[PDB]
Design a protein around this motif. Structure first.
Motif, mmCIF file in Angstrom:
data_model
loop_
_atom_site.group_PDB
_atom_site.id
_atom_site.type_symbol
_atom_site.label_atom_id
_atom_site.label_comp_id
_atom_site.label_asym_id
_atom_site.label_seq_id
_atom_site.Cartn_x
_atom_site.Cartn_y
_atom_site.Cartn_z
ATOM 1 N N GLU A 251 29.208 68.515 61.911
ATOM 2 C CA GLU A 251 29.574 69.287 60.709
ATOM 3 C C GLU A 251 30.755 68.646 60.020
ATOM 4 O O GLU A 251 31.816 68.485 60.614
ATOM 5 N N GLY A 252 30.585 68.324 58.753
ATOM 6 C CA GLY A 252 31.684 67.778 57.965
ATOM 7 C C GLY A 252 31.927 68.674 56.781
ATOM 8 O O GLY A 252 31.137 69.592 56.531
ATOM 9 N N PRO A 253 32.994 68.401 56.016
ATOM 10 C CA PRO A 253 33.224 69.183 54.813
ATOM 11 C C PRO A 253 32.161 68.965 53.779
ATOM 12 O O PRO A 253 31.445 67.958 53.823
ATOM 13 N N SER A 254 32.037 69.904 52.845
ATOM 14 C CA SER A 254 31.164 69.701 51.703
ATOM 15 C C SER A 254 31.702 68.542 50.884
ATOM 16 O O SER A 254 32.905 68.298 50.853
ATOM 17 N N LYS A 255 30.813 67.828 50.230
ATOM 18 C CA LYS A 255 31.212 66.732 49.377
ATOM 19 C C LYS A 255 31.289 67.205 47.938
ATOM 20 O O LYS A 255 30.361 67.030 47.160
ATOM 21 N N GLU A 256 32.429 67.805 47.598
ATOM 22 C CA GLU A 256 32.637 68.410 46.288
ATOM 23 C C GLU A 256 33.874 67.838 45.599
ATOM 24 O O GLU A 256 34.443 68.468 44.720
#
Ligand code: NA
Ligand code: NA
Ligand code: NA
Ligand code: NA
Ligand code: NA
Ligand code: NA
Ligand code: NA
Lengths: 263, 264, 267, 266, 269
Positions: free
Chosen positions: A135-140
């Motif tokens: 799980e990684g951060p959203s790419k926003e």
């Protein structure tokens, strides 16, 4: 929920849970992998499944109890299980001595009535990637800080790497947690343990963890440093391909419960 | 066992045990070897008897007492016996100074009514072996963690290496124990000692260690780091063949007892 | 002896002792050598007189108590202030050529004090008896093929002279019944020392029954040892092979004691 | 102001504020720049905007409250915690030692809670040699010595560009403010960050008086530098890669401030 | 003197003193030199004026007490607690850089943190740690040359800190004196030890003894003394921690030590 009085203590109105949470180098969301040393930690720009320690979670079911009565966790004993590492971690050729375990560390436990709330941050987003299995951060295009645009999730799967996800102090309402992070490339860990200490979980109003779902949620992560291969040199460029994360063998929890009336 | 009231304190209803547990780098089950430095610690794939520090155990019998009365240990004084090591440990040639003692450490004591329960875990089982003279984990393809399949035993002999066996928090019910592990290759040890401190052994209900078998079980392990040979260089590749584990010279215990009425 | 009540406090029934115990790198039993740096510490297999720090002892006589014998009155030490006297060492200890900075004091350490009614009981152990010797001017363990542990065969005696090296003799927790002591040992080849001091702290000497140190022999016995690390020669490089011949043990300049007494009736 | 009695506690007379102050490597007074690693820290004689950590400020509005006396909000305790994760390979690697570099170096941990901005003293530690870039607040150029004397530059932290390498909390001021700081030196010192959700710190003085929010807001200020780091995937802690070495800050500092009401007279 | 009761607290019978004691690398007795970094610290056998940190002293006069002398008693100011805090900022590139490690040098090395509050000057003991080899420059107070050993014995040089030129590398607080003074010190050794400076505005330290008696300002002033050495530093923009740049290595002090001392009045006989 409105919190009312505790139920008088007796054999029928108290409970305890014991568990050992095991170190987890998960391959994926539904595949925890229980081992105390990671796969070798490569020096790439990507956090890899198998070499990066993830939170361990346990959801322990509590007995059904015949306004409403719920189990309330009011104290916990928690202790790490480990042994001293000498030659098991390789040797430092230049110093003619066993390498032991050393490096950056994290010691963490949580007890709650629901999953741990976390904030996921990529610390070097121009360069660092998180492998698909983790799980990684959203790419926003959010900045690398714990602001309103930071990715927020709950630890309900096996693949939350501790190098990305931090406990969220803006949530975790019905949870107590404690963490310690130590930096440095070769810092010695210190692990104290015993069977005489206990930590209270009650707030300033005397209210512990209310198990409104009839389970207790335990979450842990305990990284002690890095190690090499037994019988091999380490802490050198020549043996960088073998350097691995060392976790504790387990984190023990004994949680004590009483009953609480709620509405 | 049902715990009832303590006996009124008097000359005849109290007792104390004093012991010094000595460091032990056993060569086998029935052969403790009391020495404060191990044989040189070799960099092979195997933990060897003689160079790996093991738990030291003592079982000290208590007087017969004329529902049943048993001795209850309610507090303990415990202290390490050591001296500063300078040139006794060799010297570091590059730094022109005595080597002293430094490295990974363990400080551990336990007091109980029966032997210490431990969990045995091989930390690198693909590569690491435990020599025949030492107690090792069972070879059952279990993972390197403290789970249900991990080897569980009691420390009832001299050959339990601290590099394998950890106190079991799921057990040890009539026992108090305290441990501290320090990692790092060259970490300085810190040993504080005195004759004024005491540690209570009573739980939340005021109940200490109930000596149901008429004995107190003491267990310790105290590794302070690594040292070289006096008069020789150390902390270099050239002299790794002489590098040895340094233990404390002893761990003193003074255990205080009263009597407790119980019903089996 | 059976301990009875304290004598009510007044000008006449209290006392205090002040002393500064000085560091001692003795060459023999009856000649303490007061200096805060030892002779250069050589890397031989022998602990040498002059380079190895020894305990310092002071036996301080207390006033005669008139009509002491009847039950007997004795002085009872019930608390102590003790503090180390030192200054920061920069260039006085030499310099590290490779790091272009003053060397300071660093290395293995021991901080130790004792207050008692009789000399300090100690255990003497050679840590590497196959290789290490104790020079003839210093008290060493007896040569009885005993293992290097604190067992019943270990050499036991009391610190009654100037030549007990701290690298051999440890306080004996099986004895020292009418004595309080506190020690801290720090290992490592280059460990920084930390010395905290002030004039506001006091340490109680009373046991669980309220009984302090009973000065049955008519004196207070003070024992100390304070090793802060190693140092070089001012103006010279140190922490290198080339200058190992000049590396010396640094002790504190002194340990201050202020011991407070009242009177206790015994029999 | 004369401080009188507190108002009895009830739902309408208590309040709390939560905030997370974010690390700030400002380019100028006008704009905080929120990022947890600075631009590469160059070894020149000048402190540069973008690579030098600055204080973060937040002014948090409090609700209006319904003789010659007034009620004001009074902050009596605070929970504050740092948000961080362990850094291994994200910080690069040490080639010589075949291991992840992690975060290490000199550190500062600092928080303040006040009824007005933080008072600071600005000092150039090496004024014969060191400059402060135009985008950062520096001390006045008045030939003053490099000490905290009466000639030292005194200002309030009311903008985004006060570098922690110049500006220290002023103990001669900060009357209606509590602050706590810890600085750790050394070139490679490991940071230690402890955090949890059980600890609280009182803000009341010896008379039981907390922070009186006379302007109807609470002023929060922080700075949390954990050390230095390299680039992920690259060597660091060497001359060859010195051009990539950057300051690492915490991801945020959480505050939860608890209030009651206090009667005061202007 | 015989100490009697405190005077009831009121606006007129309390006082406070605030001061910031500034770091001092004096070149002589009557000329304190306020700077937070010394001149470069040379590796000679002589402790040099300008590069060695000295104690800083402040003597602050207290207000006259109306009718202070009456019958056989006298009112004096009594200091009963103190807030004291160090003023500093983190040093990164301001201290130079370590070429070998590609990183800012910061401040590191041997340290001393010290404060004292008293009714008369601080009593000190002066000891040459290596008297066969080390000299103290003529501008600084040094021990007497009486062939005394390097220890705190009865032949050690004793005096009070009454001027700007007492180097901390020589002069230690004297626990056999300092009767009407409280002091606290911490020394840390090592060549590259990181300093740790904690500060805030919430902490206070009591100055009262076991009988509840603080510092009695019998000479009409409060005496403040401090020394705060945090380590060594290089020159901004230059390499440091190497032989090649040893000639630039300097002692780093704190920017100041704040004191706020609180007083009440005490009757004495
Ligand atoms: Na990778
Ligand atoms: Na359930
Ligand atoms: Na081996
Ligand atoms: Na020798
Ligand atoms: Na720059
Ligand atoms: Na407002
Ligand atoms: Na010089």
């Amino acid at each position: 929920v409105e919190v009312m009085e505790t139920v008088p203590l007796s054999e029928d109105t108290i409970y305890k849970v014991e568990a050992i949470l095991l170190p987890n180098f998960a391959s994926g969301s539904n595949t925890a992998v229980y081992q105390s040393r990671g796969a070798p930690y490569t020096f790439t720009d990507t956090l890899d499944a198998g070499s990066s320690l993830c939170y361990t979670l346990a959801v322990v079911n509590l007995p059904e109890i015949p306004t409403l009565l719920v189990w309330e966790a009011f104290r916990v004993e928690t202790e790490l299980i480990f042994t001293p590492q000498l030659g098991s971690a390789g040797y430092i050729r230049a110093q003619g001595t066993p390498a032991g375990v050393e490096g950056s560390q994290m010691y963490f436990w949580a007890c709650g009535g629901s999953p741990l709330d976390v904030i996921g941050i990529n610390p070097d987003p121009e360069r660092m990637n998180v492998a698909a299995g983790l799980e990684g951060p959203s790419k926003e295009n959010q900045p690398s800080v714990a602001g309103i645009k930071a990715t927020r999730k709950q630890v309900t799967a096996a693949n939350f790497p501790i190098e990305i996800w931090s406990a969220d102090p803006t949530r975790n309402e019905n949870c107590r947690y404690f963490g310690r992070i130590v930096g440095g490339s070769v810092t010695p860990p210190v692990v104290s343990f015993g069977n005489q200490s206990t930590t209270p979980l009650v707030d300033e109003n005397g209210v512990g963890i209310l198990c409104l779902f009839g389970a207790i949620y335990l979450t842990s992560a305990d990284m002690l440093g890095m190690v090499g291969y037994a019988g091999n040199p380490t802490l050198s460029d020549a043996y960088s391909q073998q350097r691995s994360v060392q976790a504790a063998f387990g984190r023990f929890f004994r949680v004590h419960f009483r009953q609480r009336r709620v509405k």
